[PDB]
Structures are given as structure tokens and as C-alpha cells.
Amino acid sequence: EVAIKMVVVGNGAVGKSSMIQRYCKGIFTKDYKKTIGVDFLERQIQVNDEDVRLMLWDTAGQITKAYYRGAQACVLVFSTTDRESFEAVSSWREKVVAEVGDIPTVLVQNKIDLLDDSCIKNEEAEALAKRLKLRFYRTSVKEDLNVNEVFKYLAEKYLQ
Numbered sequence: 001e002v003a004i005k006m007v008v009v010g011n012g013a014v015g016k017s018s019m020i021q022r023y024c025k026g027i028f029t030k031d032y033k034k035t036i037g038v039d040f041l042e043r044q045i046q047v048n049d050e051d052v053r054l055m056l057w058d059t060a061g062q063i064t065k066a067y068y069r070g071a072q073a074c075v076l077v078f079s080t081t082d083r084e085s086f087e088a089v090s091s092w093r094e095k096v097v098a099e100v101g102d103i104p105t106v107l108v109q110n111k112i113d114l115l116d117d118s119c120i121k122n123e124e125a126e127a128l129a130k131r132l133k134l135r136f137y138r139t140s141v142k143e144d145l146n147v148n149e150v151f152k153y154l155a156e157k158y159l160q
């Protein structure tokens with residue numbers, strides 16, 4: 001079994017904990033509880049012909065070097081309804097790079113079910129993905145849309 005440590009970063013309330021808990025535990029709740037300390041969740045999946053255990057590290061976005069240390073893949077998350085979270089993506093990217101260098105990374109626009117309150121045009125999100133040279137997924141944790149694919153992509157990229 002191959003273990004992969006993955007970090008998930010982004011501004012407060014973008015849905016980092018919701019993403020991780022949906023992926024690992026299959027649930028979603030509407031109430032916002034800011035993450036306390038660092039929470040460790042895991043999921044065992046199959047990639048090709050190999051058992052893989054994804055070790056997902058969760059912490060609040062509003063961070064110690066120990067959180068990033070040894071990270072092998074990274075999700076950069078912003079929220080459909082939070083322009084500041086989108087503007088902060090580059091800052092989060094550079095924070096991760098400064099800690100661990102070049103690791104497989106993916107850009108995620110979460111809360112896509114709230115498109116009526118969107119603060120980011122589709123073309124702006126895609127322009128950011130291109131400028132950062134990152135694969136881009138639109139997710140809804142509430143609807144369980146594309147969450148599995150985000151983590152599968154990172155696991156496949158690490159193993160390749």
C-alpha cells in the first residue's frame with residue numbers, strides 16, 4: 001500500500017473540511033464549524049493495480065510548517081461566492097511551493113451549486129488555471145460533484 005499525504009489549502013470557509021469529510025466519510029452538513037488544530041482523515045482507494053491510502057490533512061485557512069512538511073500533493077480551493085478567496089489563490093500556491101517545492105497540485109472552485117451568488121466568471125477561473133498551469137475542477141460538496149475526481153487526479157499524478 002502506497003500512502004500519500006495531501007494538503008488542502010484556501011481561505012476560511014471555502015469548504016476545505018467539507019471536501020475532505022465528504023470524500024473520506026460520505027457526509028455534508030450546512031453549519032460552519034471552523035477547523036480546530038489539524039484534523040487527519042484518510043481514504044483507501046485503488047489506482048491501477050495498487051492499494052493507495054490518501055492521508056488528508058485539514059486545518060483552518062484564516063499555518064505551521066509541520067502542516068505542509070512532507071506534503072506530496074495539494075488542493076488549492078477557492079469558493080464560488082467569495083472573491084477574496086479567488087484572489088488569494090496565488091498567495092496559497094506560493095506558500096505551498098515555498099514549503100515543499102514542486103508537488104502535484106490541482107485548482108478547485110468549490111460551492112458551484114451556488115452559481116446564482118457567483119463572484120467569479122467561468123472565464124476568470126479558467127484564465128487562472130491556465131496562468132498557474134494547473135488542472136481545474138468545479139466542485140459541489142453539497143451535491144457530491146467532482147470531489148472524488150479531484151483526489152483521484154492527485155493520486156494518479158503522484159504515482160505517475
Ligand SMILES: Nc1nc2c(ncn2[C@@H]2O[C@H](COP(=O)(O)OP(=O)(O)NP(=O)(O)O)[C@@H](O)[C@H]2O)c(=O)[nH]1
Binds near residue numbers: 018030032062114142
Ligand atoms: N452550498 C455549499 N456550501 C458548502 C459547500 N462546501 C462547503 N459549504 C459550506 O461552507 C461553509 C464552510 O465549510 P467548511 O468546510 O467549514 O470550510 P473550511 O474551508 O474548512 N473553513 P476553515 O478554513 O475555517 O476551517 C459551511 O457552512 C459548509 O456547509 C458546497 O459545495 N456548497
Ligand SMILES: [Mg+2]
Binds near residue numbers: 018034060
Ligand atoms: Mg475547516
